[PDB]
Design a protein around this ligand. Structure first.
Ligand code: CL
Ligand code: CL
Ligand code: CL
Ligand code: CL
Ligand code: CL
Ligand code: CL
Ligand code: CL
Ligand code: CL
Ligand code: CL
Ligand code: CL
Ligand code: CL
Ligand code: CL
Ligand code: CL
Ligand code: CL
Ligand code: CL
Ligand code: CL
Ligand code: CL
Ligand code: CL
Ligand code: CL
Ligand code: CL
Ligand code: CL
Ligand code: CL
Ligand code: CL
Ligand code: CL
Ligand code: NA
Ligand code: NA
Ligand code: PT
Ligand code: PT
Ligand code: PT
Ligand code: PT
Lengths: 129, 129
């Protein structure tokens, strides 16, 4: 599913992300924009042989099982394919574990490089959440 | 899901592939081995920006919608994520359309290069189908 901007923000709010570990909703929408272009089916392979899945490009090395990432963990206890569903629950729940891990949203490199420090509020403006 | 060899062959037989358009079951198992290593969650991006999904690496340019393949069709009328399920029905049904398209199993480049002309029977031997 490709989400519209306001549609994803509403879904994120409903699914418990707004101010989760101190991160306003606009942070999560901005991250999703640059990670996946709001597309739940986005995949991208990394040079280490891991793959990033879904609207927040959750990586197979630590967080989900894809059966092709040698020496990896499955900390969210899910198949990575669950992260590609039009229902975002799995991606949200796994993101809550990631963001709680110590480095906050810096775990998302595109967040650090493109959202951190910016006017993230703009990503939710105009939206009826 | 990563299938064992005999397990996938049984699933393929049950799901109507054995001799489908004249291709013995060993052809389909051999194709799946070299396309995905029998892993339903296999994805691989092509240089044209399309992506191959699932046990038979079905491509997003013609056959499934992934919302990121410009100018593409969705001839199997499915989201590409359906092709990554531990249930192979969607991949099988879409493969039946592919193989019927005119070029038979040559549509699978790894089939042409690695299975065509070989003793494909060996892929199902030892199996209780
Ligand atoms: Cl979709
Ligand atoms: Cl959709
Ligand atoms: Cl769609
Ligand atoms: Cl929702
Ligand atoms: Cl919901
Ligand atoms: Cl799993
Ligand atoms: Cl699973
Ligand atoms: Cl599992
Ligand atoms: Cl949702
Ligand atoms: Cl939902
Ligand atoms: Cl929903
Ligand atoms: Cl933090
Ligand atoms: Cl699995
Ligand atoms: Cl599984
Ligand atoms: Cl599994
Ligand atoms: Cl089956
Ligand atoms: Cl079945
Ligand atoms: Cl779709
Ligand atoms: Cl869909
Ligand atoms: Cl759809
Ligand atoms: Cl199956
Ligand atoms: Cl099944
Ligand atoms: Cl089954
Ligand atoms: Cl033929
Ligand atoms: Na993993
Ligand atoms: Na397509
Ligand atoms: Pt769709
Ligand atoms: Pt939802
Ligand atoms: Pt699994
Ligand atoms: Pt089945």
């Amino acid at each position: 599913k490709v989400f519209g901007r306001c549609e994803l923000a509403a879904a994120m709010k409903r699914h418990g992300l707004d101010n989760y570990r101190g991160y306003s909703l606009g942070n999560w929408v901005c991250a999703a924009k640059f990670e996946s272009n709001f597309n739940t089916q986005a995949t991208n392979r990394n040079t280490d042989g891991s793959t990033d899945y879904g609207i927040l490009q959750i990586n197979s090395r630590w967080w989900c099982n894809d059966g092709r990432t040698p020496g990896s963990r499955n900390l969210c206890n899910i198949p990575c394919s669950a992260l590609l569903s039009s229902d975002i629950t799995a991606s949200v729940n796994c993101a809550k574990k990631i963001v709680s891990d110590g480095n906050g949203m810096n775990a998302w490199v595109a967040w650090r490089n493109r959202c951190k420090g910016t006017d993230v509020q703009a990503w939710i403006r105009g939206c009826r959440l």
